Design an enzyme around this catalytic site. Structure first.
Site, PDB file in Angstrom:
ATOM      1  CG  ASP A   1      -2.114   0.850   1.067  1.00  0.00           C
ATOM      2  OD1 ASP A   1      -2.165   1.609   0.069  1.00  0.00           O
ATOM      3  OD2 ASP A   1      -2.987   0.803   1.960  1.00  0.00           O
TER       4      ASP A   1
ATOM      5  NE  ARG B   1       4.458  12.652   2.005  1.00  0.00           N
ATOM      6  CZ  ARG B   1       3.625  12.664   3.042  1.00  0.00           C
ATOM      7  NH1 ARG B   1       2.885  11.598   3.310  1.00  0.00           N
ATOM      8  NH2 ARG B   1       3.526  13.742   3.807  1.00  0.00           N
TER       9      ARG B   1
ATOM     10  NE  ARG C   1     -14.477  18.492 -18.223  1.00  0.00           N
ATOM     11  CZ  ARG C   1     -14.377  19.190 -19.350  1.00  0.00           C
ATOM     12  NH1 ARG C   1     -15.412  19.274 -20.175  1.00  0.00           N
ATOM     13  NH2 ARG C   1     -13.242  19.806 -19.653  1.00  0.00           N
TER      14      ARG C   1
ATOM     15  CE  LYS D   1      -5.568   2.461  -3.461  1.00  0.00           C
ATOM     16  NZ  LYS D   1      -4.666   2.219  -2.293  1.00  0.00           N
ATOM     17  CG  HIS D   2     -11.054   2.901  -1.617  1.00  0.00           C
ATOM     18  ND1 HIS D   2     -10.361   4.018  -2.040  1.00  0.00           N
ATOM     19  CD2 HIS D   2     -10.229   2.244  -0.763  1.00  0.00           C
ATOM     20  CE1 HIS D   2      -9.171   4.036  -1.463  1.00  0.00           C
ATOM     21  NE2 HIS D   2      -9.063   2.968  -0.689  1.00  0.00           N
TER      22      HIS D   2
ATOM     23  CG  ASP E   1     -13.909  -3.117   4.582  1.00  0.00           C
ATOM     24  OD1 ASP E   1     -14.198  -4.327   4.686  1.00  0.00           O
ATOM     25  OD2 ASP E   1     -14.561  -2.196   5.144  1.00  0.00           O
TER      26      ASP E   1
ATOM     27  CG  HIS F   1     -12.348   9.179  15.183  1.00  0.00           C
ATOM     28  ND1 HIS F   1     -12.080   8.167  14.285  1.00  0.00           N
ATOM     29  CD2 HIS F   1     -11.391   9.095  16.138  1.00  0.00           C
ATOM     30  CE1 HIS F   1     -11.011   7.501  14.681  1.00  0.00           C
ATOM     31  NE2 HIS F   1     -10.573   8.044  15.803  1.00  0.00           N
TER      32      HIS F   1
END
Ligand code: CL
Length: 333
Positions: A63, A71, A132, A162-163, A245, A175
């Site tokens: 992933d 990075r 758009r 995905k997803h 998932d 949350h």
């Protein structure tokens, strides 16, 4: 025999004895690595080689979390984002080059796949309907993502959209709750579903959104036979691999343990259940697959990479030509 398999993760940059032991069970079909498992390409390559000495048939996935890995881990190729690619006259060619470069390097370090491409749409609520921007240009997204997949396939890598069915319109009220997208199936079909509809025949696999679409089904998409069987395999005629998932609940909880959740995921039509960041849950899910005496889904090995580990990929002509094309497009350097 019921069919299914488990994809899990490990804690560190190398295998523990406990890692080695769990990887030997045939119901384990995959391992996903994250930034926490990655030091640099040569370490990743040797970690993959060590896993394959135990299980040459394991599917090894990264992933990259939206260019995340490249990075802060030194030494991986930095590639432009799709929005930068889109703004070129040769955007399709450049998207092919990016898919090709990413897949070539990922396989050169021993992995089978990177979970890509993203097919979710960006919706600018600041704009007004029809434009758009508010709709997110799904045909353009499908065109450029399809080009990116061509590049991945040309390098030997299977592609994972995905997803599904698209979480671009989902809203996280808080949350704790699972995000929801309360639009009708007709609205979803004409917008966020479009890239999946366009590319279902090209994709090798899909990952579901962690979203409830309550006008379509009360369950998150990864657990819904209506989403996975009726719409995805039925209406979209999708014959590839369905990942679940993440069956470990850390942010948006659902009831039951990993055992009942992996059972529910396979019941809905997933081929491979993912349990990340939770070894105790992974062993509970594995135990569930053992009592089900599952065998591997006949589809699963579609995801095995046709490239292979090597240390000379960046001196090859195709690699240099691909980078030169991104350079000419002013996308790198
Ligand atoms: Cl190849």
């Amino acid at each position: 025999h019921m069919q299914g398999s488990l994809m899990l993760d490990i804690g560190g940059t190398w295998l523990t004895a406990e890692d080695r032991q769990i990887l030997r069970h045939p119901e384990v079909g995959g391992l996903i690595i994250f930034a926490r498992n990655i030091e640099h390409p040569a370490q990743v390559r040797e970690l993959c080689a060590a896993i394959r000495a135990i299980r040459p048939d394991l599917l090894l996935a990264v992933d990259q979390e939206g260019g995340r890995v490249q990075r802060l881990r030194q030494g991986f190729v930095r590639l432009p984002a799709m929005r930068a690619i889109a703004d070129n006259p040769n955007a399709e060619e450049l998207a092919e080059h990016c898919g090709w470069l990413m897949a070539t390097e990922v396989q050169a370090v021993g992995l089978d796949l990177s979970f890509a491409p993203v097919l979710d749409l960006d919706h600018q609520r600041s704009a007004v309907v029809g434009s758009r921007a508010f709709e997110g240009d799904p045909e353009r997204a499908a065109l450029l993502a399809g080009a990116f997949i061509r590049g991945m396939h040309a390098a030997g890598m299977a592609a994972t959209g995905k997803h599904f069915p698209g979480h671009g319109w989902a809203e996280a009220d808080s949350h704790v709750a699972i995000p929801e997208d309360a639009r009708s199936l007709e609205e979803i079909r004409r917008s966020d579903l479009v890239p999946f509809a366009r590319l279902a025949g090209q994709l090798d696999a899909l990952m579901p959104a962690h979203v409830i679409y309550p006008q379509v089904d009360p369950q998150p998409a990864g657990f819904s036979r209506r989403w996975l069987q009726e719409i995805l395999r039925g209406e979209l005629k999708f014959d590839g691999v369905i990942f679940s998932d993440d069956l470990s609940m850390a942010g948006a909880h659902v009831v039951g343990d990993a055992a009942s959740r992996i059972e529910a995921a396979l019941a809905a039509g997933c081929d491979m259940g993912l349990v990340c960041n939770d070894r105790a849950s992974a062993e509970l899910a594995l135990a569930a697959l053992q009592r089900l005496k599952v065998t591997p889904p006949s589809r699963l090995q579609r995801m095995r990479g046709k490239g292979y580990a090597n240390t000379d990929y960046r001196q090859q002509p195709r690699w240099l030509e691909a980078l030169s094309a991104l350079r000419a497009a002013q996308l790198i350097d």
